[PDB]
Structure 1
């Protein structure tokens, strides 16, 4: 399923994420989009599904992110809800639960999310345009 509405779910969720801030949206993930050797779409997804999943699992109850105020704690609570959802969809479209994250370079969650939001919208374009 390649031009499935799951793409819209991914984009629609990407927007929420990209339009928010936290002390955690600056911590780094593996830049799987720093590769020159490349792969295949479903593996592009399993790899991305992987890094996103390593993050939220590593940062769900992280001290640097839980927050001082209420609006902050709320924000982080929301940040992790979305990561889980964005990831839930990625694994489904990837349909591949094994991943060789061969990369050294790290982006920031936020800058990585933009690139995912971009790749996804290009993937969408090819579905309608």
Structure 2
């Protein structure tokens, strides 16, 4: 299906995320891009979705991530909202109900999202060559 709306939506969110850092984008998550042994693209998308899921689930209510002003409060709110969108679309793209993560390597959420963006950028370039 190449560049379907699911891919277009992921790219739009990736572009909207990078347009707002939160004090918490420095917290660390598992780096499933280290891709040590060989896994398929769907397993990667699935694992990425799963790593994003572990993050909003634990840090959505984290007061330390809210800052001190209304602008920073909504920034955390928007961030959490877009990560859920990212997760469900990547999970639907993978078409998998199971993808166990064993990777030890940690990564900052910002670098993780940066690396996902490179991968989505190459995927995207695949349907308008």
Q: TM-score, normalised by structure 2?
A: 0.94
Corresponding position of 2:50: 50
CA contact (8 A) 2:11 2:120 kept: yes
Q: Distance in 2 between matches of 1:78 and 1:97?
A: 27
CA change 1:13–1:128 in 2 (3 A) is: same
CA change 1:3–1:19 in 2 (3 A) is: same
Q: Cα offset for 1:126? A: 1.5
Q: Cα offset for 1:44? A: 0.9
Q: Distance in 2 between matches of 1:46 and 1:75?
A: 26
Q: Distance in 1 between matches of 2:56 and 2:41?
A: 23
Residues 85-113 of structure 1 show CA distances to partners (whole Å, capped at 9, x for unaligned) of 11121111111121211111111111110
Any stretches of 5+ residues in structure 1 without a counterpart? none
CA contact (8 A) 2:2 2:126 kept: no
- Report 1:1-129 matches (<5 A): 1-129=1-129
Residues 51-80 of structure 1 show CA distances to partners (whole Å, capped at 9, x for unaligned) of 000001110001210222111111101110
Any stretches of 5+ residues in structure 2 without a counterpart? none
Instruction: Give the RMSD, CA atoms, in angstroms.
Output: 1.2
Q: Cα offset for 1:2? A: 4.2
Consecutive aligned runs of 4 or more in structure 1 exceeding 6 Å deviation: none
Q: TM-score, normalised by structure 1?
A: 0.94
Q: 1:32 is paired with a residue of what secondary structure?
A: coil
Q: Distance in 2 between matches of 1:127 and 1:108?
A: 30
